[PDB]
Structure 1
Amino acid sequence: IMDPRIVSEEHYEVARRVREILQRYKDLQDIIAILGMEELSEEDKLIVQRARKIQRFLSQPFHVAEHFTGRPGKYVPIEDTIRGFKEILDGKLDDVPEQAFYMVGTIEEAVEKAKKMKK
């Protein structure tokens, strides 16, 4: 069902840009380990940071698992999933630490969390 004729053009375009940037980061983690990260170009350096935020932004705290970790649990609607990844991919939200995107639900919750961590 991942076709423009069954789901929105914005849904199809974001999901494509996500799979692409993740694959590009996978093609570079050998070079990032053997050679200094200071050897990567400006474009690739930003591509790595965005892939790093997106990789954890896919994480979500579940209600049935609240007892294990103590995290309340979240439900995210389709409009906010698309809007969240689009805002990261479009490079609007860059001056926010990677730790803020781990276990948060919607992207506004990640933005307040950055501040909760005093950053």
Structure 2
Amino acid sequence: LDPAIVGDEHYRVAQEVIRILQRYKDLQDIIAILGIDELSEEDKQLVNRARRIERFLSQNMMAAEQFTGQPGSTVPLKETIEAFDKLTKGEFDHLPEQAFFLIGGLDDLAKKAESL
């Protein structure tokens, strides 16, 4: 992973995701007892975004066909980076968190979210 090998957009996306998860882990200690009432909204939004991006990484590979009874999914890298950048823009804040659980793609994301 280096900007010389891969374009700068991918590098920026990776750095932003890394920083977001690092901040979430850092605040985990305080939130472990008190929670978000003591915490400020400027960090509440960060908590929400971290939770959504963490739940989004879940995927349904075809190897679980013998357990879950559902087909697998595959996504090209361009769609993946586009969807992740869109999520990091925070547009998807309105959507419920559970919809991100074990989803295939952004089209399936929207279909599942609007199905509930």
Count of paired positions: 116
- What is the CA–CA distance in structure 2 between the aligned matches of 1:43 and 1:100, rounded to whole Å? 24
TM-score, normalising length: structure 2: 0.93
Please list the CA deviations of residues 68-101 of structure 1 after superposition, one character each: whole Å capped at 9, or x if unmatched.
Answer: 1123211011011111111111111110011111
Task: Identify the range of structure 1 (44-53 vs 27-36) with the bigger mean alpha-carbon deviation.
Answer: 27-36
Residue 35, structure 1, aligned to residue 40, structure 2 = no
Counterpart of 1:14 in structure 2 is 13
Unaligned runs of 5+ in 2: none
Runs of 4+ with deviation above 3 angstroms = none
> What RMSD, in angstroms, separates the aligned Cα atoms of the two structures?
1.1
What amino acid is aligned across from residue 38 of structure 2 in structure 1?
A: E
The alpha-carbon deviation at position 55 of structure 1 amounts to 0.7
- What is the CA–CA distance in structure 2 between the aligned matches of 1:20 and 1:105, rounded to whole Å? 25
- What is the CA–CA distance in structure 1 between the aligned matches of 2:44 and 2:35, rounded to whole Å? 12
- What is the CA–CA distance in structure 2 between the aligned matches of 1:54 and 1:71, rounded to whole Å? 23
Residue 86, structure 1, aligned to residue 75, structure 2 = no
- What is the CA–CA distance in structure 1 between the aligned matches of 2:70 and 2:41, rounded to whole Å? 37
- What is the CA–CA distance in structure 2 between the aligned matches of 1:95 and 1:76, rounded to whole Å? 24
- What is the CA–CA distance in structure 2 between the aligned matches of 1:14 and 1:36, rounded to whole Å? 28
Summarize the alignment of residues 1-119 of structure 1 with structure 2, pairs less than 5 Å apart. Answer: 2-116=1-115, 118=116
